[PDB]
Design a protein around this ligand. Structure first.
Ligand SMILES: *[C@@H]1O[C@H](CO)[C@@H](O)[C@H](O)[C@H]1NC(C)=O
Lengths: 239, 212
């Protein structure tokens, strides 16, 4: 029942400061080394820093040195990560991981380090669920909706693909429906992307019969409840 | 810096699969301190293997670790549905740092493999009139959920202004992804063609659009 619970994450503006926390339970915190590991969206695990049991030895990755500071409060069972001047590229999930440790065994004899200290085992045995940091300068903004018109290039014999480009919005929840909900078959709304701007963009596509192009009208119903914007756009084929 | 892993490894239930992890003499080749982590969607990572070949308590005998020179390997025998996820190798550094690999998506095949359907949309005239331009590449119905997307302006590749999503399930259990190439209306009209090149399971699809 060893646990690690991260907090402090959310939406923060670039150039600002931010303190992340990680509360440990179910083990004696001061006996172990602790790490911070980040994961940028759709990317791999990336080691940030390690702090010794006593908080006297600190190691930081070269990509994070100068930006972040690791600390711990052995009286409060807490780990910290302090940011000075955040950058839009710092956007990631931050995981708190315990460094595995204990005595070294030799001929069925337990050996400890000076002052009953544990030796590091060189693996992370307990992990938290993470806290997400989203660095963006943006304020509430409604989307721009553009048609992704069907043509020969989007026609796969019998059917045809058409969509809606939902550009430059903030914050995250955008909803897309087709023909006021009357069309659900063949609909896919892709996850949003977070551009260098600090704004999100997304696409929604629908597969329809090629016969209907010219007769049936297709409309995407875009919903941005945070900006109270609703956009109904008719995607029709071009010439 | 990062240890090198294949992006995707797949197999049928019961099969045996292997994940490689390439490092150097200052990490993988330097110590017997290679650990492996499994990350299931919505779940915290968990240690599978440590110190090259050792298993923690509660980890199945089906997971085994090995090392040869600067290369470490994780083997999964009798592949199970619950082994699906991303696998990361890690190593201790000669600087007392930790280095992780890029990760490997492990798919336990539950349906036949499908190559992607690629639809490339040029910027709409509405967008061009708004002094913006976006090329939209839609990648759908592929399985397993791992693709590589590359853009070309004429025949030369373009890395600036590219944003690609991570594949997600498209309700019918297949995966979909999208990639965008943001340009100024001027850049769009300055080149003869633009291409979206998608690689899945060693096979490639390339669609081309031209300012017309
Ligand atoms: C790593 O190196 C080995 C041999 O040293 C090779 O066979 C393998 O394809 C490589 N793996 C990656 C992910 O580059």
């Amino acid at each position: 029942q060893e646990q690690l619970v991260e907090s402090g994450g959310g939406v923060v503006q670039p150039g600002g400061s931010l303190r992340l926390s990680c509360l440990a339970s179910g083990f004696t915190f001061h006996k172990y080394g602790m790490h911070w590991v980040r994961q940028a969206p759709g990317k791999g695990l990336e080691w940030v820093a390690l702090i010794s049991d006593d908080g006297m030895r600190k190691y930081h990755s070269d990509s994070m040195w100068g930006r972040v500071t690791i600390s711990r409060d052995n009286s409060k069972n807490t780990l910290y990560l302090q940011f000075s001047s955040l950058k839009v590229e710092d956007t990631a999930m931050f995981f708190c991981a315990r460094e595995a440790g204990g005595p070294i065994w030799h001929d069925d004899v337990k050996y400890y380090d000076f002052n009953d200290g544990y030796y590091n085992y060189h693996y992370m045995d307990v992990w938290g669920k993470g806290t997400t940091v989203t660095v963006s300068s943006a304020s509430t903004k409604g989307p721009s909706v553009f048609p992704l018109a069907p043509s020969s290039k989007s026609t796969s014999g019998g059917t045809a693909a058409l969509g809606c480009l939902v550009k430059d919005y903030f914050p995250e929840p955008v909803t897309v429906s087709w023909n006021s909900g009357a069309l659900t078959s063949g609909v896919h709304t892709f996850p949003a992307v977070l551009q260098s701007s600090g704004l999100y963009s997304l696409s929604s596509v629908v597969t329809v019969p090629s016969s209907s192009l010219g007769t049936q009208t297709y409309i995407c119903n875009v919903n941005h409840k945070p900006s109270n914007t609703k956009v109904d756009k008719r995607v029709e084929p071009k010439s | 810096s990062a240890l090198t892993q294949p992006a995707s490894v797949s197999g049928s239930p019961g099969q045996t699969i292997t994940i490689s992890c390439n490092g150097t003499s200052s990490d993988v080749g330097g110590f017997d301190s290679v650990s492996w982590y499994q990350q299931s969607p919505g779940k915290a990572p968990k240690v599978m293997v440590f110190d090259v070949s050792h298993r923690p308590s509660g980890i199945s005998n089906r997971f085994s670790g090995s090392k040869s020179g600067n290369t470490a390997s994780l083997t999964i025998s009798g592949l199970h549905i619950e082994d699906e996820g991303d696998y990361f190798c890690s190593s201790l550094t000669d600087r007392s740092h930790r280095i992780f690999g890029g990760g490997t998506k492990v798919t336990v095949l539950g349906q036949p493999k499908a190559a992607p359907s690629v639809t490339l949309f040029p910027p709409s005239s509405e967008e061009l009139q708004a002094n913006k331009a976006t090329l939209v590449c839609l990648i759908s119905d592929f399985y397993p959920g791992a693709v590589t997307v590359a853009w070309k302006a004429d025949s030369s590749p373009v890395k600036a202004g590219v944003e690609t999503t991570t594949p997600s399930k498209q309700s019918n259990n297949k995966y979909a992804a999208s990639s965008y190439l943001s340009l100024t209306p001027e850049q769009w009209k300055s080149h003869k063609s633009y291409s979206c090149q998608v690689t899945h399971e060693g096979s490639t699809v390339e669609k081309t659009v031209a300012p017309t």
